[PDB]
């Protein structure tokens, strides 16, 4: 089955179905449906299997010809082979759904600066498709890995433009596909498939297949008695996973967090509530109230407050679709792709049109402008494409369809970023996040400690009095280490914890949150406005 693929499966179902699931004379009513799509991603996971399955679900000829099996030694035979296949597709259009499936177009497309015959090949298949446009039921699915690998000249409108990625290896789909694979394999009954799954970060389905493969392989190897029924044990499974190569590689944090895992600065909490989530009720609120929605807000606090936690809690308290934007997710070794993934995630926001998009630590996402004057050009290119795309606007004038994503950013070095970002019209609100006061310290200690083994001797208020210049993470690591001391030292197998260990751990973690740095931070990024 289409394990871990049914969502992309059905999206592509409707998309490619639109010309096929419904007749043509309506197109003849003055409409030209796009024809020819792209499936980009690591294959073997089911891409082939899924295109099979969907041509089935609609009812269509699974003409699963492998275009890599058409290479020619002399220019001209290749074009005749393509004539053969595309003509059979044409007679298929003469009969019904010509669901031509041609894989690995990029190997048939070495991009510019390459030799000549690629030109003949691509132009000739272009003739084929542009002519068969006249025919009634001509559709092709180029199956590759990355769209960038294909011919640029094959990405025009009225050409291969409807492109979709293979399924990103999600947890849910991971479990689905493990079960689907083993649905024909005699794995052991007791299987904590979720454990192995969460071990298999970044591992696409096919990787998981292969992993199970070698697992059962060594199972059969180091066992000989039950030659037919293997209890393919989770131990051999684990060891195989260990042996296996790591994965080759917009990850939304599935982890939900509420307003309880966070205390202090409830003023800023209510502010975020003001300028972000009330917009949900907006379609009638500003009506009886006037004021519009501020496009962009920028929350700034000292590095160490883990603002990301607050952002994720916000994303939790709204149910709105959420995607994250991080530099580590961004800094891939492909120059010119950062802008691309930016556009991609914004397009996804448009897709799940109610969308909240987070721009973390943008000083990392966008470094300095003119500090290193030799390698900071593509960064300004991302700057330009950002300043362009950040213009999400609508009718919004005196029922309403609230099709308007929202963008929120946060960082620690705003004095580094490009000043035009803060443009009234792009980022029309900025909020401050001071490190907690005595009360905030007390509260965040209380809430971070509500699961550690507490003893009847501690007095959090004293730490609060003395744990000044402490970040959230500071206090969290502090109570952590102190618990460790208490437990190990006294109770090798313990029950309680004493405050003495916190007192001792104080110096162990040197709090370098100098109040002068606080004043510097504040003055800088309050004049940043």
């Amino acid at each position: 089955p289409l394990g871990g693929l049914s969502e992309a499966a059905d999206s592509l179902r409707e998309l490619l179905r639109l010309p096929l699931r419904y007749p043509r004379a309506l197109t003849a009513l003055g409409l030209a449906v796009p024809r020819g799509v792209l499936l980009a991603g690591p294959p073997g996971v089911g891409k082939t299997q899924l295109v099979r399955a969907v041509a089935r679900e609609a009812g269509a000829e699974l003409l699963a010809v492998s275009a890599p099996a058409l290479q020619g030694s002399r220019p001209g035979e290749t074009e005749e082979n393509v004539r053969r296949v595309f003509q059979r597709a044409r007679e298929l259009a003469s009969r019904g759904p010509s669901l031509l499936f041609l894989d690995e177009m990029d190997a048939l497309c070495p991009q510019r600066g390459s030799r000549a015959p690629e030109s003949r090949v691509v132009a000739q298949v272009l003739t084929l498709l542009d002519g068969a446009s006249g025919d009634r039921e001509v559709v092709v699915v180029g199956a590759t890995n990355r769209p960038d690998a294909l011919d640029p000249a094959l990405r025009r409108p009225g050409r291969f433009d409807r492109e979709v990625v293979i399924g990103t290896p999600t947890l849910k789909q991971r479990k689905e596909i493990l079960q689907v694979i083993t649905s024909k394999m005699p794995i052991s009954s007791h299987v904590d498939l979720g454990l192995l799954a969460e071990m298999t970060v970044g591992y696409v389905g096919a990787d998981l297949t292969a992993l199970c493969r070698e697992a059962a392989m060594h199972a059969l190897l180091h066992s000989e008695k039950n030659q037919d029924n293997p209890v393919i044990d989770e131990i051999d499974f684990l060891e195989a996973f260990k042996n296996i190569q790591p994965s080759s590689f917009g990850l939304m944090d599935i982890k939900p967090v509420d307003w309880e895992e966070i205390g202090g600065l409830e003023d800023v909490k209510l502010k975020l509530k003001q300028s972000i989530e009330w917009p949900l009720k907006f379609p009638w609120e500003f009506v009886r109230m006037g004021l519009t929605q501020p496009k962009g807000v920028l929350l700034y606090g000292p590095p160490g407050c883990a603002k990301t936690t607050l952002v994720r809690a916000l994303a939790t308290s709204c149910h709105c679709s959420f995607v994250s934007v991080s530099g580590a997710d961004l800094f891939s070794p492909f120059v010119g792709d950062s802008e691309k993934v930016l556009s991609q995630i914004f397009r996804q926001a448009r897709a799940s049109t109610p969308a909240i998009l987070f721009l973390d630590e943008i000083d990392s996402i966008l470094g300095a402008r003119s500090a290193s004057k030799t390698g900071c050009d593509v960064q300004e290119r991302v700057l330009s494409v950002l300043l362009n795309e950040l213009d999400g606007v609508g009718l919004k004038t005196i029922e309403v369809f609230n099709r308007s994503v929202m963008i929120i950013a946060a960082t620690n070095r705003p004095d580094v970023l490009d000043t035009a970002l803060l443009r009234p019209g792009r980022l029309d609100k900025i909020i401050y996040i001071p490190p907690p006061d005595h009360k905030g310290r007390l509260s965040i200690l209380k809430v971070c400690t509500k699961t550690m083994p507490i003893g009847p001797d501690v007095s959090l208020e004293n730490l609060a009095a003395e744990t000044c210049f402490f970040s959230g993470a500071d206090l969290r690591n502090l109570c952590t280490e102190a618990a460790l001391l208490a437990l190990q030292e006294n109770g090798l197998d313990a029950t309680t914890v004493k405050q003495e260990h916190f007192l001792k751990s104080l110096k162990t973690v040197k709090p370098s949150l100098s109040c002068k740095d606080l004043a510097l931070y504040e003055n800088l990024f309050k004049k940043e406005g």
Binding site: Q274, W278, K281, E285, R288, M289, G290, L291, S370, K373, I398
Partner: protein
């Protein structure tokens, strides 16, 4: 360049400028950045030169700190008529308030007088933000209330501070007094 070309092509038209001091940070400060700046300013002079060619093709600009410009634009002939935009008087403030109330359902406890009183040293758009935030406060009173209460307005007034000191107006008027032509 293409800007001026199109301008000519659509001759009955008006070029506009804003925040001139941005490009008008004087050279030497940034060694590798002000170069394009001075190139641009030079080419700007090179374009505007066609003043005769600018057959009644006026140029309007405005900025905040007019000193920061080069007098190559303030040399006589090209940009000579100058006007300081006076801060809004009481009547202008009341008109701003009218244009604000004409888009939000407000209560009847309004009183334009002391509003205009406690809105001096502010700018119009800032006062728009003030009444906007007061509407936000009423929304905080109830997610489905109707009319904003002027007590919450006074609360907002307390919250908002005029980040513009009168010293700035002093400097404005001083420059006005100590500059070239006004009419």
């Amino acid at each position: 360049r293409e800007t001026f070309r199109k301008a000519r092509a659509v001759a009955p038209s008006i070029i506009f400028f804003d925040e001139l001091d941005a490009l008008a940070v004087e050279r030497g400060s940034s060694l590798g950045a002000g170069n394009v700046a001075d190139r641009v300013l030079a080419q700007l002079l090179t374009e505007m030169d066609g003043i005769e060619q600018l057959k009644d093709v006026t140029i309007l600009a405005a900025t905040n700190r007019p000193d920061r410009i080069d007098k190559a634009l303030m040399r006589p002939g090209r940009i000579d008529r100058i006007i300081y935009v006076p801060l809004p008087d009481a009547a202008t403030r009341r008109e701003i308030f009218k244009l604000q109330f004409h888009s939000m359902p407000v209560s009847n406890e309004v009183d334009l007088d002391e509003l205009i009183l406690q809105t001096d040293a502010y700018s119009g758009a800032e006062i728009v933000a003030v009444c906007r935030e007061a509407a936000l406060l009423a929304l905080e009173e109830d997610i489905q209330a109707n009319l904003i209460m002027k007590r919450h307005f006074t609360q907002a007034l307390s919250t908002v501070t005029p980040r513009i000191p009168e010293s700035l107006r002093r400097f404005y008027e001083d420059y006005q007094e100590k500059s070239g032509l006004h009419t």
